[PDB]
Amino acid sequence: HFYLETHCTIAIPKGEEGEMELFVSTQNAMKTQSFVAKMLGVPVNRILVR
């Protein structure tokens, strides 16, 4: 692909109810959200992807 900007993610752990806010260079915020939730083992509503 050689997108000038390579893959990148910032993950912010809240410390409350498994909440995590992420800033990601992706075309798929949905799958990013569910995949991160699946790995953490928390409901999808706890994950915010921006």
Give the tokens for residue 18.
Answer: 């498994």
- Residue 6 CB, shortest distance to its own copies, in Å, is 9
Instruction: Tell me how far apart the alpha carbons of residues 44 and 19 are, in angstroms, rounded to a whole number.
Output: 10
Q: Is residue 33 annotated as involved in ligand binding?
A: no
Q: What is the DSSP string of 11-50?
A: EEE-SSTT-EEEEE--S-HHHHHHHHHHHHT--GGGEEE-
Q: Which residues in the 1-50 window bind its own copies by CB under 8 A?
A: 3, 5, 8-10, 12, 14-17, 19, 23-31, 33-34, 37-50
Annotated binding residues for Mo-molybdopterin, written as ranges, equal: 27
Q: Which residues bind its own copies (CB under 8 A)?
A: 3, 5, 8-10, 12, 14-17, 19, 23-31, 33-34, 37-50
